Amino acid sequence: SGFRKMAFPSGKVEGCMVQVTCGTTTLNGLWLDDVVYCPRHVICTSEDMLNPNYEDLLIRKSNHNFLVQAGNVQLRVIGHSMQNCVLKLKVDTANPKTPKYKFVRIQPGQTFSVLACYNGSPSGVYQCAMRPNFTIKGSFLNGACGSVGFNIDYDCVSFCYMHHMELPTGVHAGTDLEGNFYGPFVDRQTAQAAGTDTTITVNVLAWLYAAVINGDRWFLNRFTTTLNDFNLVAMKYNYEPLTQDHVDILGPLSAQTGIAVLDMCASLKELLQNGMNGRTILGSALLEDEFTPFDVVRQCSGVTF
Amino acid sequence: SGFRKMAFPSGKVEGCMVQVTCGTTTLNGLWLDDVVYCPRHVICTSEDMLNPNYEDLLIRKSNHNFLVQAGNVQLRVIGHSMQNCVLKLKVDTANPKTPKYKFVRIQPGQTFSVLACYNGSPSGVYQCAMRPNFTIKGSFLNGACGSVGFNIDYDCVSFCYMHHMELPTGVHAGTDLEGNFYGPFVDRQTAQAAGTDTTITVNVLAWLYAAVINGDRWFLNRFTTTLNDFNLVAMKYNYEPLTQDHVDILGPLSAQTGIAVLDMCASLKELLQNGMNGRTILGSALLEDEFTPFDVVRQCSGVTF
């Protein structure tokens, strides 16, 4: 028992991290087979970032202008190209530590592990949710760009995130591994609005189920509700609307606990309307939304990789 | 910027995890050089655990009763011996993936990463504090015993914890890697009292410094305090007394922020006495005590391994 925010083991990803330098700028890259993927803003000076013409900046660069180091091994760059906001550097050696992998574009509300890296070297690992507004609340200092986010299923790493920027508001924005930003963001040092963020309702419900399984049950009440009634309340509290698809995803947790999903919605409704009265759930004094239904099941059933 | 509960990269430890079976019981082992370390209670049946005579039970075991599997490769046990509460299984092969390592016994209040494993396979990674009462508040299902806790400094893994027991209250107990329990605990399935726990004051202060560095400063005040006065309040709120050693450890964070340590204590005193009034600090509605001063510095300065 117990319930913790748990990251995936990072070993398969650590073996793919490299340092990429282009002139003055160093950041991280991801080495899979004979390609290294990194943020295209590696080619920018501090001044360039205010309004970069990436096509023009890249034209000034040649293969030998990209210094790629994998530990102490210098890779030889034999080609370069830009795909959306990522650079793909073709190298003359396939990464011998390449895991089975996929590139996936994740949905808002899904979770993933981040391996924060500096100068090609892993610093730490933590779990993140993709916010409904397509930001993440990470931990990234200068040099962290090119750090990736991922999920593991069995032996296969699904890469879903590459870190590119910190918005003036202190939240983080990045791309999938095809270089397409999540959200409306661009790789330019400009004020950028993230939308209104909302709480990930299906995740809060999953976490309430986790709480019951662990024996934290004070918030269970004698009421039920309907989807439409619940959603009137969700909207007022800037929660995501709950759909039948969400109810369906919660089915296994409903079955384990014997608590109908709409009964748990009525418990959540009371918590929203009345607050938590200084009480805690699973060691938290706020409603936690960074655990997916699958996360809860995984942790409550001991799935391994 | 941003501040997250961040675990160490687990790759060096993943390469050391194996499965150990003895009869009906399977749990995890740690393979370093030509020794596999695991909880000695692997040799117990469910019934044995109620009141085991480990010396007698081990005598009835032979090398060939211990099935040790590293992925799909069967290792061959050529010896067994017991050190305190850990079993050392001598194997005929040195682990080729053995990292530089030390065995360390950590102090209450210190933090470490846990690699939760099942059947010798890594499941997830999270950061834990050793509570003042020598428990940990982990996440461990059936089969997690033998999972280890560790820190990394540069290239060296310092193992500090091996998981043994879930107490009837749902908190966790375990040993250093020489098999000595942290706290008063024993490897017997019996009711066992944990101390009164307390909050790790120096860690709360470190986290308040982390908050300031990250731009959360509402809780700062121009009140002052003395160590003796502060400690009168700490005692009332079941906080650990703060010593000059603790003040000294917070010195670098004091210097970075320009906030004297006793000024931060006066801020903490107000938070304890008056509560947080529905406000948050670093995304938390409670005072967080699982970040050490060194953890804060590490994360705020981007140290890598």
UniProtKB/Swiss-Prot annotation, chains A, B:
Top-level lineage group: Viruses
Record topology, Cytoplasmic segments: 1-305
Effect of L205V: In strain: Zeta/P.2
Effect listed in the UniProt record for changing K90R: In strain: Beta/B.1.351
Modulation of this protein's activity: Inhibited by pyridone-containing alpha-ketoamides compounds 13a and 13b. In turn, alpha-ketoamide 13b (tert-butyl (1-((S)-1-(((S)-4-(benzylamino)-3,4-dioxo-1-((S)-2-oxopyrrolidin-3-yl)butan-2-yl)amino)-3-cyclopropyl-1-oxopropan-2-yl)-2-oxo-1,2-dihydropyridin-3-yl)carbamate) inhibits SARS-CoV-2 replication in human lung cells. Inhibited ex vivo by michael acceptor inhibitor N3. Inhibited ex vivo by compound 11a and 11b.
Localization per record: Host cytoplasm; Host Golgi apparatus; Host nucleus
Catalytic residue positions: H41, C145
Residue ranges occupied by any Peptidase C30 domain in the UniProt entry: 1-305
Catalytic activity field: TSAVLQ-|-SGFRK-NH2 and SGVTFQ-|-GKFKK the two peptides corresponding to the two self-cleavage sites of the SARS 3C-like proteinase are the two most reactive peptide substrates. The enzyme exhibits a strong preference for substrates containing Gln at P1 position and Leu at P2 position
Glycyl lysine isopeptide (Lys-Gly) (interchain with G-Cter in ubiquitin) cross-link site: K5, K90
Function: Cleaves the C-terminus of replicase polyprotein at 11 sites. Recognizes substrates containing the core sequence [ILMVF]-Q-|-[SGACN]. Cleaves and inactivates human TRMT1, preventing tRNA guanine(26)-dimethylation of tRNAs. May cleave human NLRP1 in lung epithelial cells, thereby activating the NLRP1 inflammasome pathway. May cleave human GSDMD, triggering alternative GSDME-mediated epithelial cell death upon activation of the NLRP1 inflammasome, which may enhance the release interleukins 1B, 6, 16 and 18. Also able to bind an ADP-ribose-1''-phosphate (ADRP).
Subunit record text: 3CL-PRO exists as monomer and homodimer. Only the homodimer shows catalytic activity. Interacts with host FBXO22; this interaction promotes the proteasomal degradation of nsp5.
Protein's recorded name: 3C-like proteinase nsp5
Organism: Severe acute respiratory syndrome coronavirus 2
Classification lineage: Viruses, Riboviria, Orthornavirae, Pisuviricota, Pisoniviricetes
Residues represented out of the complete protein: 3264 to 3568 of 7096
